[PDB]
Ligand SMILES: Nc1ncnc2c1ncn2[C@@H]1O[C@H](CSCC[C@H](N)C(=O)O)[C@@H](O)[C@H]1O
């Protein structure tokens with residue numbers, strides 16, 4: 001993968017710096033802003049966690065096997081700073097093995113400290129590994145029950161996507177659940193291109209909808225940009241600048257309804 005070096009370097013700044021920008025829980029793929037969002041926590045932390053929850057409610061409603069004794073091994077593909085690793089360990093205390101995979105070393109070092117200081121090292125495993133290489137993860141005899149792609153697919157070429165889905169198919173039992181959040185154009189990736197790549201690789205889409213709303217995602221980018229303006233006004237950091245560019249330019253594509261955040265719940269055949 002020739003685009004990995006560019007992905008690694010864009011998430012390379014200190015967690016202390018990123019904390020000011022996206023929240024203390026480091027949720028980095030939008031948020032649901034409804035009556036079940038916690039009003040006590042930072043809007044970004046509460047909405048981001050509420051988005052993950054809402055997606056598991058959609059999955060459950062769509063007929064996915066997400067019961068306590070159905071989830072023995074989960075994988076978080078492009079796990080960022082690790083917010084979903086902690087969330088899975090709490091939602092599934094009897095899940096034996098939660099594997100995070102990421103290409104970003106600084107994200108995994110932070111995730112590693114959080115997992116450790118909350119005594120989750122027993123169950124949560126962190127791998128510096130391209131999503132296309134998940135076929136090389138340990139213990140192939142123990143299949144995946146659950147797979148999360150929270151905002152990770154944007155960074156994938158068609159080839160990496162293909163290889164990631166091939167590899168996950170081979171490592172995932174029939175009926176294992178795939179929970180995907182991604183921003184897609186409705187005219188890089190579209191709903192239909194992603195639907196195709198899933199169905200071409202042994203996955204059935206059982207729920208497919210806009211989530212969160214364009215209104216809510218615009219608001220989420222709002223909160224980020226306010227934090228970016230207050231902490232990095234003078235475009236000192238080229239990575240935070242590039243996030244400002246995206247917050248501005250994608251918010252406008254969302255305003256013109258040229259794109260949306262999509263939830264895809266799929267199921268291994
Ligand atoms: N090919 C690849 N293999 C593994 N991780 C990848 C990847 N391409 C992108 N990523 C990771 O995908 C993540 C996307 S950002 C989203 C982070 C996290 N899922 C969250 O929701 O908070 C980044 O951490 C990036 O390093």
Ligand SMILES: CC1=C(C)[C@@](C)(CC/C(C)=C/COP(=O)(O)OP(=O)(O)O)[C@H](C)[C@H]1C
Pocket residue numbers: 028029030150151152154182183246249250253
């Ligand atoms: C987890 C996240 C993601 C998966 C991100 C990337 C959302 C996907 C987006 C907007 C990628 C930006 O694409 P691009 O640079 O082409 O934007 P344009 O110039 O409008 O075309 C967020 C940074 C973050 C919340």
